[PDB]
Amino acid sequence: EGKLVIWINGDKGYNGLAEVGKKFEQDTGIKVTVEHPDKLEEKFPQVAATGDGPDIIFWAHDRFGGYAQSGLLAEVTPDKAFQDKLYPFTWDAVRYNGKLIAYPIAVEALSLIYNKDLVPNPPKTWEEIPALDKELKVKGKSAIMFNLQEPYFTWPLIAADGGYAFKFENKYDVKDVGVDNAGAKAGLTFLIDMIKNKNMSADTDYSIAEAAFNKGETAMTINGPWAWSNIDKSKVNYGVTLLPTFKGKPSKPFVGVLSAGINAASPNKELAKEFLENYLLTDQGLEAVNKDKPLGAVALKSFQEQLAKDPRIAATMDNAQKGEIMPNIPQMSAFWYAVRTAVINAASGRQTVDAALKDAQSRIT
Numbered sequence: 269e270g271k272l273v274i275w276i277n278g279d280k281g282y283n284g285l286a287e288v289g290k291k292f293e294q295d296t297g298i299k300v301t302v303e304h305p306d307k308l309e310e311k312f313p314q315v316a317a318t319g320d321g322p323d324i325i326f327w328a329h330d331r332f333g334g335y336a337q338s339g340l341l342a343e344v345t346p347d348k349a350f351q352d353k354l355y356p357f358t359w360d361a362v363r364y365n366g367k368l369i370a371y372p373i374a375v376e377a378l379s380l381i382y383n384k385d386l387v388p389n390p391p392k393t394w395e396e397i398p399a400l401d402k403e404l405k406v407k408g409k410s411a412i413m414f415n416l417q418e419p420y421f422t423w424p425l426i427a428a429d430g431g432y433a434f435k436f437e438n439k440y441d442v443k444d445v446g447v448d449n450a451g452a453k454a455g456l457t458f459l460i461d462m463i464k465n466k467n468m469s470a471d472t473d474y475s476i477a478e479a480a481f482n483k484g485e486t487a488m489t490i491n492g493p494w495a496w497s498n499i500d501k502s503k504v505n506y507g508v509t510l511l512p513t514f515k516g517k518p519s520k521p522f523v524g525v526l527s528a529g530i531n532a533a534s535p536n537k538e539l540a541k542e543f544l545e546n547y548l549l550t551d552q553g554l555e556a557v558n559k560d561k562p563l564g565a566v567a568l569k570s571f572q573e574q575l576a577k578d579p580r581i582a583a584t585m586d587n588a589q590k591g592e593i594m595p596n597i598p599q600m601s602a603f604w605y606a607v608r609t610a611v612i613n614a615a616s617g618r619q620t621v622d623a624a625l626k627d628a629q630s631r632i633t
């Protein structure tokens with residue numbers, strides 16, 4: 269009691285958040301400690317269920333319905349004046365069983381990131397990437413590298429031709445899952461065909477793809493706004509644009525709302541409200557985080573007006589509008605775990621595309 273402990277993922281601007289915390293302490297005398305534990309999103313329900321953990325947890329909104337279902341989150345209590353400061357759809361992302369259970373911070377979607385000096389006119393279709401890779405390979409380069417270990421990054425291609433997570437009835441139907449339909453299989457088959465053709469490697473992860481793109485070894489990558497800061501520091505002149513189409517249809521990235529939840533076991537709920545409402549969710553607070561690692565589009569209207577001019581933010585929102593907001597329902601984690609296994613198994617040859625996605629479908633339903 270009398271201090272704030274915050275958990276936020278290691279790819280976000282946690283040093284910039286810590287600067288917001290130091291301003292909070294200067295004004296209130298209350299120490300703010302920012303940590304970025306690994307697997308924090310799995311650790312939180314295990315320690316919050318024993319009355320331990322951080323006061324505030326940051327994650328995309330898809331994790332928070334499971335937390336709320338287990339009673340681990342405090343209902344947030346912003347007045348109507350504060351609610352009108354943020355975009356209504358961001359509040360929708362953090363509403364569960366009619367109650368607001370987090371503060372929305374930022375809106376994230378994946379984009380195509382490309383090296384302007386290797387591919388001045390980036391490809392508009394996935395289907396043209398193998399021919400581009402062939403020309404780059406004679407120069408000792410590759411067309412594209414992105415994280416193949418996390419299903420977040422492969423989902424936009426799987427969804428393009430018809431894959432989906434849970435069908436929404438304008439409630440989600442947890443038994444109507446689109447992981448093993450013909451569109452999902454077509455997109456995962458194309459990924460596997462690029463791997464078989466040695467346009468990509470099944471073992472490429474986040475670090476490998478980031479290093480290759482930022483050193484100028486691959487012409488393109490797929491990542492979110494948090495990655496731009498490291499590219500700014502690199503020698504690479506990059507642009508951010510629409511994901512390629514597949515079979516003429518847009519890639520459909522899942523849209524995540526970075527959100528801050530207050531632990532139901534926190535003895536500091538009033539302090540957490542003060543910090544999130546009056547320090548973080550201000551133009552100056554978001555700027556401090558954004559200058560560390562870019563947040564993407566932000567939930568705070570006044571600051572989003574200042575970011576909307578950036579072509580990288582414009583591309584982020586264009587991809588977001590072609591994609592889908594993630595469900596926040598507890599079943600979303602089962603979806604992600606099952607799809608992760610399916611993609612890794614198909615990409616590594618441990619299963620066929622059909623057998624992998626059928627098994628995921630059975631697991632989820």
Ligand SMILES: OC[C@H]1O[C@H](O[C@H]2[C@H](O)[C@@H](O)[C@@H](O[C@H]3[C@H](O)[C@@H](O)[C@@H](O[C@H]4[C@H](O)[C@@H](O)[C@@H](O)O[C@@H]4CO)O[C@@H]3CO)O[C@@H]2CO)[C@H](O)[C@@H](O)[C@@H]1O
Nearest residue numbers: 279307309310328330331376418419420524601604605608
């Ligand atoms: O044992 C397998 C892995 O299990 C753990 O990872 C899980 C997560 O616990 C799940 O929540 C889920 O992860 C989703 C995530 O919830 C979702 O928001 C999105 O994550 C993006 C994030 O929004 C974005 O801001 C940025 O940080 O990139 C993330 C993606 O890397 O998508 C995730 C799914 O890819 O599913 C994974 C399993 O895939 C555990 O943390 C791992 O250590 C473990 O490998």
Ligand SMILES: [Mg+2]
Nearest residue numbers: 306307308309
């Ligand atoms: Mg983690």
Ligand SMILES: [Mg+2]
Nearest residue numbers: 341342343367
């Ligand atoms: Mg509640």
Ligand SMILES: [Mg+2]
Nearest residue numbers: 417418473612
């Ligand atoms: Mg792995």
